[PDB]
Amino acid sequence: FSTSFKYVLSACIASFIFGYQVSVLNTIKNFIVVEFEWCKGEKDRLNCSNNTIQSSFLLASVFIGAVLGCGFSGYLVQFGRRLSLLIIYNFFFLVSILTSITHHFHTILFARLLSGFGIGLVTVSVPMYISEMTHKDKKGAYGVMHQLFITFGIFVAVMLGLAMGEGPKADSTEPLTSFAKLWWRLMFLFPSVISLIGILALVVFFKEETPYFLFEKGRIEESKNILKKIYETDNVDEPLNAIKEAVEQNESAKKNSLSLLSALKIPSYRYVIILGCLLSGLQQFTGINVLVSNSNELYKEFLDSHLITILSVVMTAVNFLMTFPAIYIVEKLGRKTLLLWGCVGVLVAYLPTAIANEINRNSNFVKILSIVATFVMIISFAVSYGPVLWIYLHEMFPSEIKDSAASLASLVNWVCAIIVVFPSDIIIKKSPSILFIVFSVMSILTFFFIFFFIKETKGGEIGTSPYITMEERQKH
Numbered sequence: 001f002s003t004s005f006k007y008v009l010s011a012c013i014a015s016f017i018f019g020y021q022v023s024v025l026n027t028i029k030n031f032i033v034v035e036f037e038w039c040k041g042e043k044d045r046l047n048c049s050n051n052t053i054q055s056s057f058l059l060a061s062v063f064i065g066a067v068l069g070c071g072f073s074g075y076l077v078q079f080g081r082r083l084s085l086l087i088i089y090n091f092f093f094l095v096s097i098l099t100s101i102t103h104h105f106h107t108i109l110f111a112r113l114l115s116g117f118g119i120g121l122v123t124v125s126v127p128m129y130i131s132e133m134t135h136k137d138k139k140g141a142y143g144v145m146h147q148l149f150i151t152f153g154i155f156v157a158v159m160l161g162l163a164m165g166e167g168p169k170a171d172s173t174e175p176l177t178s179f180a181k182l183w184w185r186l187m188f189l190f191p192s193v194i195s196l197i198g199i200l201a202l203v204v205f206f207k208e209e210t211p212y213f214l215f216e217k218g219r220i221e222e223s224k225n226i227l228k229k230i231y232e233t234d235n236v237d238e239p240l241n242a243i244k245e246a247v248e249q250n251e252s253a254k255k256n257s258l259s260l261l262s263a264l265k266i267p268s269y270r271y272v273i274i275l276g277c278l279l280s281g282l283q284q285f286t287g288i289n290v291l292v293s294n295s296n297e298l299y300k301e302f303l304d305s306h307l308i309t310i311l312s313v314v315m316t317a318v319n320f321l322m323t324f325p326a327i328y329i330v331e332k333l334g335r336k337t338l339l340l341w342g343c344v345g346v347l348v349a350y351l352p353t354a355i356a357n358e359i360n361r362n363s364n365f366v367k368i369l370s371i372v373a374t375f376v377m378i379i380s381f382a383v384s385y386g387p388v389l390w391i392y393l394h395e396m397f398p399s400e401i402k403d404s405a406a407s408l409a410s411l412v413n414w415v416c417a418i419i420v421v422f423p424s425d426i427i428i429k430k431s432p433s434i435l436f437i438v439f440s441v442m443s444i445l446t447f448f449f450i451f452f453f454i455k456e457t458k459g460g461e462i463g464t465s466p467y468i469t470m471e472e473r474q475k476h
């Protein structure tokens with residue numbers, strides 16, 4: 001509950017909007033389907049081809065938007081981290097209002113595409129802000145707060161969706177409740193109020209920018225004040241000197257015309273960047289978004305509306321609760337060890353499920369095992385790979401490519417989200433065993449990847465990497 005902790009709370013407000021925006025549409029989609037009358041032409045008003053295609057575009061728009069958001073964020077952060085947060089809040093305020101008043105597939109598609117862009121901004125900005133506003137020994141611990149409120153956002157959106165009539169019947173013709181028509185729009189409108197809270201927090205209490213940013217553009221004295229404020233100490237010679245060395249290397253870098261595109265042709269920098277993009281993209285091959293995006297579609301085959309609803313609530317609850325231990329584990333045991341154990345937990349989840357489905361595709365025992373395996377996969381991901389990745393991406397790079405490569409890696413993550421989710425939706429309908437055996441193989445490969453190539457980044461100074469040492473960065 002330090003000061004640096006009030007500051008990360010201010011940044012985690014955007015992380016709450018992150019999680020909320022990702023899961024809000026999925027929660028109340030069926031209501032939109034009936035109201036917008038996407039399948040009013042056919043007998044079934046909830047299940048038709050038109051709904052499937054348009055829902056695919058809606059999900060794709062968020063992912064694509066997130067890709068663009070991550071790319072632009074690399075350029076936007078240059079003018080400030082706190083500035084990025086302010087822009088995010090102002091942006092989400094209008095986008096949420098716009099989404100609240102949509103009446104057609106095109107306007108809501110446009111709204112979600114924008115909402116995705118804001119998400120891509122949050123993906124890079126918030127973990128970077130927390131990175132430069134916390135103690136080096138407590139970076140990881142607070143870095144979990146980012147993932148924590150993401151998880152919390154996903155949970156709150158599901159909880160608010162319980163105020164609904166728990167869904168309209170697919171074969172019925174009963175019109176929605178006037179309350180239900182109002183409430184799903186209000187759910188879209190809720191992050192506008194949250195955005196206002198985010199703006200108020202930054203402009204009233206947390207006016208300062210990060211000490212790293214302030215020092216980088218000349219504000220040395222003002223950098224000292226915010227540095228002394230977050231550390232609660234008059235003597236801040238060591239972290240200031242760490243920033244001074246990082247910034248000086250940035251100045252030498254700009255002189256050598258070093259950029260992300262230029263560093264890629266340098267084998268020393270290419271190595272750490274490729275490793276960063278690999279680790280970032282491999283988070284999606286855990287299949288976590290397959291569950292997040294299609295929680296209803298996955299269990300619609302052997303579970304009814306009420307149980308799917310209960311399952312959704314419990315899944316998001318566990319996904320949120322199991323994030324808390326990461327605050328202690330990430331720093332105490334390290335990031336690499338947690339990643340390795342996380343991969344083991346993922347393997348333990350998918351491989352027995354793959355074997356069970358291969359033996360018998362329609363066994364009752366398989367259905368039950370699939371439910372338990374879900375929670376095993378959720379607990380494993382929520383405690384490790386989820387939180388750690390965004391913490392690691394802002395600890396593994398030298399200062400010259402610190403922000404740019406982190407943005408590139410974040411972009412790859414959302415690109416892989418497109419690569420994993422949509423084909424998985426097609427595969428799991430044909431043969432779940434094949435999809436589950438691919439995830440098992442990927443879980444093993446990811447284990448070996450981290451085990452052999454990934455180094456620990458705990459307690460590292462700002463702008464330092466375990467891969468490239470200071471003197472080695474000078475010859476470049």
Ligand SMILES: CCCCCCCCCO[C@@H]1O[C@H](CO)[C@@H](O)[C@H](O)[C@H]1O
Nearest residue numbers: 035097098100101102103181182185186
């Ligand atoms: C740019 C600000 C616009 C906000 C205007 C709010 C007016 C009252 C909102 O009630 C609206 O009543 C419509 C009747 O057709 C419904 O269709 C629509 O779903 C519902 O939202």
Ligand SMILES: CCCCCCCCCO[C@@H]1O[C@H](CO)[C@@H](O)[C@H](O)[C@H]1O
Nearest residue numbers: 061104105106107108109110111112113
């Ligand atoms: C960000 C989303 C942008 C979507 C752009 C889609 C452009 C091509 C489709 O245009 C739409 O053709 C419909 C015919 O079905 C018309 O009914 C509707 O009035 C019109 O808008």
Ligand SMILES: CCCCCCCCCO[C@@H]1O[C@H](CO)[C@@H](O)[C@H](O)[C@H]1O
Nearest residue numbers: 027158161162292295309312315316319
């Ligand atoms: C890691 C957890 C991933 C799960 C997140 C996706 C959950 C999507 C929300 O589902 C919906 O929940 C509503 C209750 O709010 C139900 O009324 C509705 O029937 C159901 O479709």
Ligand SMILES: CCCCCCCCCO[C@@H]1O[C@H](CO)[C@@H](O)[C@H](O)[C@H]1O
Nearest residue numbers: 287290291298301361370373374428432
């Ligand atoms: C990658 C997202 C899912 C993570 C792992 C959770 C497995 C839960 C899904 O269970 C599977 O549901 C299929 C529905 O098609 C059934 O056919 C199959 O028998 C059953 O095993």
Ligand SMILES: OC[C@H]1O[C@@H](O)[C@H](O)[C@@H](O)[C@@H]1O
Nearest residue numbers: 147150151288289292386387
């Ligand atoms: O909590 C679930 C979320 O965790 C984040 O770490 C992943 O990047 C998201 O794709 C996932 O949806």
